[PDB]
Amino acid sequence: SHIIIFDIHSEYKSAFEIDKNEDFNLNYLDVEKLKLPYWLMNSEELETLFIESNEQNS
Amino acid sequence: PKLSNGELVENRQIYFNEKLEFTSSNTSKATKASNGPFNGEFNRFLSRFETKLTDKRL
């Protein structure tokens, strides 16, 4: 069974966090543990991240 | 149009064969170079278009 949850303001962590003896491994990817290599980005997202906005860049 | 290697362009058709490097801009009277009418206006267009060209699911 495969489920993916993109939860802004995380709330469903408790709903699936049953006791450890029940053997239900939960992969809690939070901002601290999240590993997104920036070099995988494409043109649009690279420009959005670095070039920014709010200015007529020279 | 003036090439980087002190060369003028007579016919605007050598662009199709390859990519050319031009001389930088300056305001000195002896060596005066001005930006072209379409200089730097196709930046995002070039980025998106090259993104289209690179991907080969199409």
Side-chain angles (χ1 to χ4, degrees):
Chain A
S1 61
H2 288 155
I3 202 61
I4 297 169
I5 297 89
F6 291 158
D7 49 332
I8 190 167
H9 315 139
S10 66
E11 287 154 63
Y12 294 102
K13 182 200 187 164
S14 57
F16 292 165
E17 210 183 348
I18 62 170
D19 189 358
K20 306 180 180 186
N21 282 333
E22 318 289 322
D23 189 358
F24 195 86
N25 304 282
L26 169 72
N27 168 346
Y28 193 72
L29 273 194
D30 71 20
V31 60
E32 293 83 3
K33 297 211 198 265
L34 183 63
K35 291 190 296 269
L36 294 174
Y38 64 91
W39 43 271
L40 283 176
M41 293 180 183
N42 58 349
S43 66
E44 183 178 1
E45 292 162 33
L46 264 189
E47 294 192 12
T48 312
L49 180 60
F50 295 134
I51 304 295
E52 293 179 353
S53 81
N54 69 42
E55 182 196 75
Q56 180 35 254
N57 64 7
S58 76
Chain B
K2 178 179 143 178
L3 297 189
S4 80
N5 294 295
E7 266 284 337
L8 298 194
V9 173
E10 299 292 327
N11 196 2
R12 211 182 274 185
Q13 282 183 353
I14 45 167
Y15 290 174
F16 289 120
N17 288 127
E18 51 160 354
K19 304 180 152 192
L20 294 174
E21 201 174 8
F22 293 3
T23 300
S24 47
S25 73
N26 46 3
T27 56
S28 307
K29 274 303 300 186
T31 61
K32 193 180 174 194
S34 172
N35 271 7
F38 301 121
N39 198 294
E41 298 194 7
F42 296 178
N43 276 312
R44 277 65 170 253
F45 181 24
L46 274 177
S47 85
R48 296 291 185 269
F49 182 76
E50 207 167 5
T51 307
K52 284 291 177 175
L53 277 296
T54 45
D55 188 8
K56 59 185 56 63
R57 51 175 156 91
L58 182 50

